[PDB]
Write a protein that binds this ligand. Sequence first.
Ligand SMILES: CC[C@H]1OC(=O)[C@H](C)[C@@H](OC(=O)N2CCC[C@@H]2c2cccnc2)[C@H](C)[C@@H](O[C@@H]2O[C@H](C)C[C@H](N(C)C)[C@H]2O)[C@](C)(OC)C[C@@H](C)C(=O)[C@H](C)[C@H]2NC(=O)O[C@@]21C
Ligand SMILES: [Mg+2]
Ligand SMILES: [Mg+2]
Ligand SMILES: [Mg+2]
Ligand SMILES: [Mg+2]
Ligand SMILES: [Mg+2]
Ligand SMILES: [Mg+2]
Ligand SMILES: [Mg+2]
Ligand SMILES: [Mg+2]
Ligand SMILES: [Mg+2]
Ligand SMILES: [Mg+2]
Ligand SMILES: [Mg+2]
Ligand SMILES: [Mg+2]
Lengths: 58, 113, 134, 205, 108
Amino acid sequence: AKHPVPKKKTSKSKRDMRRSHHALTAPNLTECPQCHGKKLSHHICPNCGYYDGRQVLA
Amino acid sequence: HGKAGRKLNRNSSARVALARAQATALLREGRIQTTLTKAKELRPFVEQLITTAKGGDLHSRRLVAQDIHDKDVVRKVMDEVAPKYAERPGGYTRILRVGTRRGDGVTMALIEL
Amino acid sequence: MIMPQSRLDVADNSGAREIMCIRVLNSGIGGKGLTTGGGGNKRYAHVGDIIVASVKDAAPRGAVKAGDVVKAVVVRTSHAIKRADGSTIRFDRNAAVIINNQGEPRGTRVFGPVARELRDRRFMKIVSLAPEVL
Amino acid sequence: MKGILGTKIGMTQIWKNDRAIPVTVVLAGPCPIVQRKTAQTDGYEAVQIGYAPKAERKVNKPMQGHFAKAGVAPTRILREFRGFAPDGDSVNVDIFAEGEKIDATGTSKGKGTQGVMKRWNFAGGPASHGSKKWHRRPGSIGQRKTPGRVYKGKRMAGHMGMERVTVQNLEVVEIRAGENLILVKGAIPGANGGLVVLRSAAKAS
Amino acid sequence: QTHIKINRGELLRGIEQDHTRQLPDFRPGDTVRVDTKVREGNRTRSQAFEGVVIAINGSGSRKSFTVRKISFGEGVERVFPFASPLVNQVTIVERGKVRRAKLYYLRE
RNA sequence: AAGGAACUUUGCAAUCUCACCCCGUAACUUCGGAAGAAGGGGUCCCCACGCUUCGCGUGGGGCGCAGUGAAUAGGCCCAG
RNA sequence: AUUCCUUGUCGGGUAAGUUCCGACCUGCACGAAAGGCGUAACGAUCUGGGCGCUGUCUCAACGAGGGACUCGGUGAAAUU
RNA sequence: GAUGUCGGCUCGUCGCAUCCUGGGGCUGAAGAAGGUCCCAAGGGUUGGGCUGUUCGCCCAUUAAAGCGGCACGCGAGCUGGGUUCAGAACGUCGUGAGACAGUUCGGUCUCUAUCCGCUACGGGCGCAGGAGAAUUGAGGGGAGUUGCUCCUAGUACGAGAGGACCGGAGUGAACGGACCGCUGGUCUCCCUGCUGUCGUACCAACGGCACAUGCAGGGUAGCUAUGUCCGGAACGGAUAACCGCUGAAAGCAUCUAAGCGGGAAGCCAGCCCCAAGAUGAGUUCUCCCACUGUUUAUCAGGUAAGACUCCCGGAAGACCACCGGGUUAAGAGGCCAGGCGUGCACGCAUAGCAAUGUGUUCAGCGGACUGGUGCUCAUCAGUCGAGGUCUUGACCA
Ligand SMILES: CC[C@H]1OC(=O)[C@H](C)[C@@H](OC(=O)N2CCC[C@@H]2c2cccnc2)[C@H](C)[C@@H](O[C@@H]2O[C@H](C)C[C@H](N(C)C)[C@H]2O)[C@](C)(OC)C[C@@H](C)C(=O)[C@H](C)[C@H]2NC(=O)O[C@@]21C
Ligand SMILES: [Mg+2]
Ligand SMILES: [Mg+2]
Ligand SMILES: [Mg+2]
Ligand SMILES: [Mg+2]
Ligand SMILES: [Mg+2]
Ligand SMILES: [Mg+2]
Ligand SMILES: [Mg+2]
Ligand SMILES: [Mg+2]
Ligand SMILES: [Mg+2]
Ligand SMILES: [Mg+2]
Ligand SMILES: [Mg+2]
Ligand SMILES: [Mg+2]
């Protein structure tokens, strides 16, 4: 058949313990020096399209 | 280990096709939006292309034609762009990071000259 | 780099034309005849090393005839030999000289150049018949 | 005991009399003596030495204090040497002699995850007479019902390299003080530009 | 690892000029190379190896050239460090016309 | 690299060989065969001369490590 | 492709041959259309040897691509 | 309602009734070579030919080519030769269908590991303030083999032939570790050459495709062994068999009854590596320093020293982790110079009927190497992180 197979159901406890590292880390959001919508460090502000001057359209 | 120093993600032929492909795009358009990595690999190949063109002689032209298979882009690079870069000690390529895509979730970037 | 099964050109007139390695030994030569082994492992014979061998091709009329289990000293090798100054020697073909149990040649003369390493390894009589000692 | 810190520069080919010698060049730069460990203060005898210079801006407040106490200049590398108590601020001149046998130590080049064939000189298996285990793969990890376990220590694939390695009794071929250089016969562990720890033979012959 | 502001290139070059030897303007073609065989006990011999330069690998201390000869019916190749103390002098016997740097084809 | 079956139940596997032209070819035989036996040589470019073409032969000359220059492409033998 | 005793015995080939070839006859338990002996040619047949070549091997290395690893999308299974 | 069965390979570990090497006692031990018994398990214990073979026989060596255990160790590790499926044959038995003590050729070995176990690597929290760094070593692991030659010395011994112990030098083998300077290997586009065909209008020069490099020749960094460099130890302490000192019981004798010394490749220590989750959580240096909060929100919140996040990279790496840089900037790229590799570029001129050759040109081109240089991006920010419990004692204003 399907050669190595689990021997016993993994308990609600054991299953959950394994998920103690699955939690997403929230982005470190910065506020744009211009358009004043929040942005990602080292990226162009989505809203105004600025990164010192304006690079992207809108 | 692997202390080499280059970067592919396809087969020999393809790595060269992509390089030349995007190099023609940037040189023709002046600014292209692509994947970050893809853009990173492009930066030196295109930067090296400008230096060849910065020769001005037929050989320098013919050398560019080995990578740029567009009759017009080769003229744009030879006669227009390379001369404008005359006193720039190499460096005209800048990469800005735009931000994550929907499908693959890939972080996009801009590359302009 | 000679090892059991390696076939080699014979650099003498002992009658043998081609010998085949049977055993790489830890090549004696001192006081009495040749000395007894410096271990039983030892995978490669180099120039100046003694090997045990079976004769595969022998000339009609000669001391050594086919299928004789014999001793020979390696005189030439395709595998490069390195000298203390930094110099390297390497020969197109590997060759050996059949010897008796006191390490003296079995033939009257030696053919082609021999490695200087034989001189160091105390093989006086071989190095004496030798046309060149590169 | 009498030791120093340097940087692996490279390997070259050099002659002494009529024979060629493979040499590892070490820049055993000047070492500020920064802390003297005494049985009275620390409970054992040692010297804390320093190695490459650090820009004052790059140095944090706590490390500035540690250096200012000895009144040096900030370094980057700090190591101790047991039972070695010199006077002043440690340099190879008079420390090592031309000919002296030494104990070169460093961190081996790291080869990341390496399987049993490279990591332990295994054997793997047949490349042709029927296989699914073609070359690398270990064999049997154990036995049967008996130690229904696998021996602790069992040689297995893991991260290979990037370990502390000491190479005993290396000849001091040449010394170029002022240039702060030392030529060593043979191969010291680690890569060029790596930290090296040259000392007195651990136990000389 | 020790991030010292250093020119390892030059530092190596420094401990190498004292063990570097300029030899004649040769590329392939024939040459008499005059080795000094001190190794014949206390007696210092002189043997000359004369053949075609097949290769020229290396630079600095490590620069060497490969000579190929046919001696008493058997092919011989010698590799010499330019700065080998057992080398006395190499001399262009005659210059050759080749279309590459390695000429290993001469092995057949 | 050097070695070349030492692998192994077993050269299993994987190489070598590889097209066309010329020379050449064994025991044995039901005289058909065995035979593509085995083995060896040639092969590209230019010019001039000859002919039966799409092409070929002879001469001289040229270039490369290499000329079925890449793809398709028999390993062979002895004995049961 | 038959033999137990058996790796019979002697010779061949191998440095060394429980297999293989050849003799011998003591055929446990060959034998004449359940055909006996032989036979050129044919065989993806089976056995044994040789030349060639080789990563099968001493003894493995480097390199490539596709997985394996990482992220974003969708998300099974035997088992318990 | 299934514990896969011989041999091989791979991988080991363990017993000692020890094959070698180490120490001894007796010998029908002169010496050398042995015999035999005792102590001793640290390491070592070769490659082939025949057979499915384990075994055994042979070849050639060796210090030696040990015997056993681990489900006749190991198939969720590999093989599948042997044996025990279905085809087929021979011998034999059976009237037969079939059969074996047999013999012969053939014959599917099941991608995903849940727990324990094992190798690597992180996240968490603890270690009575928050931090940067240097560390002791309780403990643990690795390693541990041996020949040959010379000197002692042609001495001891021996009638001679021969020929040492003890001590002291060298040099291998196999194993291991590191390393890439050498010698080589590779180096999937760094350089050149070559074919067919298609394209860039044509010529000339190039590009694609012929592998997931079309093929060939070479090759830097890197990685690599077949290439180098080092290694097993010396000294010590306690022992083993064993050899002895002092010495009674037993006016002698006795190595023992009390005491003491010596004595092994073994034991502990020494060598190399890990190591304070050593919850028994150790030590040293250095830094910051006592902030705010209505009996309505009983500890949260600004912050320090310091770090993380993000970015650009790395002889670090699966991911994490680790090291470096982040404009107060040479981190990476580019660019400049150099090295190194390839081996003489395109274009033009000349020579020739042409193929081609010569010059210009040690050309030209150029991955990873060594520097330099502010041309490009390391922008801008955000997040987090102390204000130190109690009891006793001692010193103190
Ligand atoms: C390839 C997949 C295929 O498996 C196989 O064919 C292998 C090769 C076969 O092996 C084999 O049949 N064999 C025959 C002998 C060699 C090989 C084998 C045996 C054991 C282990 N490995 C290989 C099995 C292991 C065999 O079991 C074995 O049966 C033996 C009767 C007893 C064994 N026990 C003791 C553990 C058992 O494992 C059975 C009978 O199958 C066919 C198992 C049963 C459950 C079955 O029918 C599966 C559904 C089977 N059918 C399918 O489509 O998929 C499967 C999984
Ligand atoms: Mg293998
Ligand atoms: Mg099992
Ligand atoms: Mg080379
Ligand atoms: Mg017959
Ligand atoms: Mg996913
Ligand atoms: Mg059974
Ligand atoms: Mg004894
Ligand atoms: Mg190299
Ligand atoms: Mg190539
Ligand atoms: Mg004692
Ligand atoms: Mg930082
Ligand atoms: Mg640079």
